[PDB]
């Protein structure tokens, strides 16, 4: 229609960019200063997940609303097939700090074989990263100095990237397959930040000691974006979607969150904790033993009063939505299934939109609208109060009033952002692991 905008796709990441053969897993965010940040996995040996790859994190920036982009940078790179996989972006509006979090595995490890627990040990009230030698003897890293099990200082030291130095000379890296001292083979959550609008980024901080429980095997970022709560008692809280597996390997979603501008993090309960299934069974994420109730990658949005809605990948074939009245600490026992929205067991993106649409608060959603990773569709969902819960809290539902096919054929992971002009940017996997496409759309197009 006249006035509708849907730009022709640009290959924002593609084979050869930064000398990476493959790319996957988009994240897209507009900063407070109006800059667009796009992050992605630079998958260097094909498209596979860890451990069958060597994956680095890459970022591109646009300072002109997505019309032109910078030459890109690699911001995290571990050696010898240790990978960083699945990024998410969020900014703290109060301080201007941008966070990028990612899952990190040592060489040989990934989702399916991650070991139990955080990989940290408490010694006299502080958590310290553990390292193991070939015989399984345990050492700890205390302010980057390696101590043995008797708390004798050794000749070894580390840095934030896991390099291992003997008397100050680098000999290996605790994340490699060859090191004489190795971190535990499991997932770690890494956080980096930028205070200059994405131009420069910190060394990684390993926050597993704050968020990963002893009974979790995998705990990983759910890729895309986080939120900072705008309304209500938890205004300011930074919320980052994650998901984990228990000792039986079964997946449950949750969020991690920070109330002190990203300095410290907490994991909330899962919607699987005290969840009431359709057959009436009350489950929890620590004991979940069946595949059907699994809840995996997720993204979160906020309702007008601050209530949170967690949109989750799951095994039902349709969208699942959880509700939190306490800022992501816990969730209501009923996970809703929205049979208006197919969910083929793939990541989805959902964001709040800043302007009312047809007199209602709205969200924008993107996923493959099919029983497979295809038919990529962007939707506008209008928020209505439909009633209350028995506890008196408002009960909200979505009306998926506008649904637009944007990508015929292959469509997998994606990430949305609202742009400064009120339009919508979208970075999507329109190929399995090669070209990652960026488009800008206006509401006239999405409604047409
Ligand atoms: C850490 C990791 O492996 N992430 C991968 C994730 C995961 O394998 C699945 O969620 C496990 O159930 O899946 C996929 C996928 O295309 O489906 C891509 C992610 O990069
Ligand atoms: Ca690497
Ligand atoms: Mg463009
Ligand atoms: Mg090496
Ligand atoms: Mg080797
Ligand atoms: Mg609950």
Q: Experimental method for this entry? A: X-ray
d(CA 261, CA 263): 6
d(CA 290, CA 310): 21
Evaluate: CB of 105 within 6 angstroms of ligand 1: no
Q: Ligand 1: which residue has its CA nearest to atom 17?
A: 346
Among the bound ligands, name the one nearest to the CA of residue 83.
2
In a shared domain, residues 248 and 301: yes
Evaluate: CB of 26 within 6 angstroms of ligand 1: no
In a shared domain, residues 141 and 25: no
d(CA 357, CA 363): 9
**CATH number, residue 378:** 2.120.10.10
Classify residue 274 by burial, with Cβ atoms within 10 Å: 0-12, 13-18, 19+. middle
Q: Which two tokens stand for residue 230?
A: 């705008």
What is the atom index within ligand 1 of the atom nearest the CA of 105?
1
Q: Which two tokens stand for residue 379?
A: 């939707």
What is the atom index within ligand 1 of the atom nearest the CA of 86?
20
Residue 39 CA, ligand 5 centroid: distance in Å = 30
24, 25, 43, 49, best to mutate for ligand 1 pocket (most atoms within 8 Å of CB): 49
In a shared domain, residues 123 and 98: no
Q: Residue 254: which domain range? A: 1-118+185-448
In a shared domain, residues 277 and 323: yes
In a shared domain, residues 101 and 37: yes
Evaluate: CB of 194 within 6 angstroms of ligand 1: no
What is the chain's Cα-based Rg?
A: 22
d(CA 413, CA 294): 19
CA angle 217, 223, 228 (to 5 degrees): 105
φ and ψ at residue 30, rounded to 5 degrees: -100, 125
For 284-393, strand residue ranges (E) read: 295-302, 308-314, 318-324, 336-342, 349-352, 362-368, 374-388
Residue 107 CA, ligand 4 centroid: distance in Å = 9
What is the atom index within ligand 1 of the atom nearest the CA of 41?
20
Evaluate: CB of 321 within 6 angstroms of ligand 1: no
CA distances from 274 to 252, 270, 334, 389 (A): 12, 9, 9, 17
d(CA 288, CA 275): 10
Residue 220 CA, ligand 5 centroid: distance in Å = 26
Give yes or no for a contact between 173 and 82, defined as CB atoms under 8 angstroms apart: yes
d(CA 176, CA 173): 6
In a shared domain, residues 217 and 328: yes
Among the bound ligands, name the one nearest to the CA of residue 38.
3
Cα dihedral sign, 138-267-363-3: negative
d(CA 7, CA 439): 5
The DSSP element (H or E) to which 424 belongs, if any, is strand 424-429
**CATH number, residue 164:** 2.40.220.10
Residue 211, classed as helix, strand or coil, is helix
Bridge partners of residue 362, in order along the sequence? 382
104, 111, 250, 349, best to mutate for ligand 1 pocket (most atoms within 8 Å of CB): 111
Among the bound ligands, name the one nearest to the CA of residue 12.
3
In a shared domain, residues 434 and 375: yes
- Number of independent structural domains in the chain: 2
CA distances from 371 to 360, 405, 413 (A): 30, 15, 14
Q: How many other C-beta atoms lie within 10 A of the C-beta of residue 323?
A: 21
In a shared domain, residues 153 and 192: no
Residue 165 CA, ligand 5 centroid: distance in Å = 19
In a shared domain, residues 32 and 126: no
- With CA atoms as reference, report the closest residue to 309 among 246, 392, 239: 239
Evaluate: CB of 297 within 6 angstroms of ligand 1: yes
In a shared domain, residues 158 and 28: no
In a shared domain, residues 404 and 258: yes
Q: What resolution, expressed in A, was reported for this entry?
A: 1.5
In a shared domain, residues 6 and 69: yes
Give yes or no for a contact between 99 and 238, defined as CB atoms under 8 angstroms apart: yes
Catalogue the active-site residues: 49, 297
Cα dihedral sign, 224-226-231-232: positive
Q: Is 446 left (phi over 0), alpha (psi -120 to 50) or beta?
A: alpha
Evaluate: CB of 306 within 6 angstroms of ligand 1: no
Q: Please spell the DSSP secondary structure of 327-346, one letter per residue.
A: TTS---SPPEEEEEEE--SS
The DSSP element (H or E) to which 393 belongs, if any, is none
């Amino acid at each position: 229609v006249e006035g509708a905008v849907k730009t022709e796709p640009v290959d924002l990441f593609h084979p050869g960019f930064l000398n990476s053969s493959n790319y996957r897993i988009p994240a897209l965010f507009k900063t407070k200063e109006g800059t667009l940040i796009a992050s992605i996995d630079a998958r260097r040996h094909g498209g596979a997940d860890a451990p069958n790859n060597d994956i680095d994190t890459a970022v591109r920036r646009s300072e002109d609303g997505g019309k032109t982009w910078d030459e890109g940078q690699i911001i995290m790179d571990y050696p010898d097939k240790s990978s960083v996989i699945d990024t998410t972006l969020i900014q703290d509006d109060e301080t201007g700090r941008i966070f990028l979090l990612v899952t990190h595995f040592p060489s040989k490890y990934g989702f399916w074989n991650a070991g139990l627990g955080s990989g940290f040990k408490n010694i006299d009230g502080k958590e310290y990263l553990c390292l193991y030698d070939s015989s399984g003897k345990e050492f700890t890293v205390r302010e980057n100095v390696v101590y043995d099990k008797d708390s004798n200082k050794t000749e070894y030291t580390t840095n934030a990237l896991g390099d291992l130095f003997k008397n100050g000379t680098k000999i290996d890296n605790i994340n490699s397959s060859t090191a004489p001292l190795k971190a535990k083979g499991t997932s770690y959550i890494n956080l980096v930040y930028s205070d200059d609008d994405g131009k420069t980024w910190s060394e990684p901080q390993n926050i597993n000691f704050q968020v990963k429980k002893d009974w979790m095997k995998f705990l990983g970022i759910a890729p895309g974006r986080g939120i900072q709560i705008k309304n209500g008692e938890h205004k300011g809280r930074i919320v980052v979607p994650v998901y984990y597996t228990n000792e039986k390997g079964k997946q449950s979603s949750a969020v991690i969150y920070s109330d002190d501008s990203g300095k410290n993090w907490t994991i909330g309960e899962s919607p699987n904790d005290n969840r009431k299934l359709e057959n009436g069974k009350i489950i929890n994420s620590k004991t979940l033993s069946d595949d059907a109730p699994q809840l995996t990658e997720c993204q979160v949005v906020e309702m007008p009063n601050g209530q949170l809605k967690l949109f989750m990948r799951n095994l039902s074939g349709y969208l699942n939505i959880a509700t939190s009245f306490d800022g992501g600490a816990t969730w209501d026992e009923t996970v809703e299934k929205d049979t208006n929205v197919l969910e083929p067991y793939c990541q989805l993106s959902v964001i709040n939109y800043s302007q009312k649409v047809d007199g209602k608060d709205a969200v924008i959603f993107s996923n493959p609208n099919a029983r497979s990773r295809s038919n990529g569709t962007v939707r506008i969902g209008l928020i209505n109060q439909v009633g209350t819960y028995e506890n008196g809290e408002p009960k909200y539902e979505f009306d998926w009033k506008y649904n637009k096919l944007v990508k015929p054929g292959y469509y997998a992971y994606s990430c949305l952002t609202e742009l400064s002009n009120g339009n919508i940017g979208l970075l999507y996997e329109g190929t399995p692991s090669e070209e990652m496409s960026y488009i800008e759309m206006n509401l006239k197009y999405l409604e047409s």
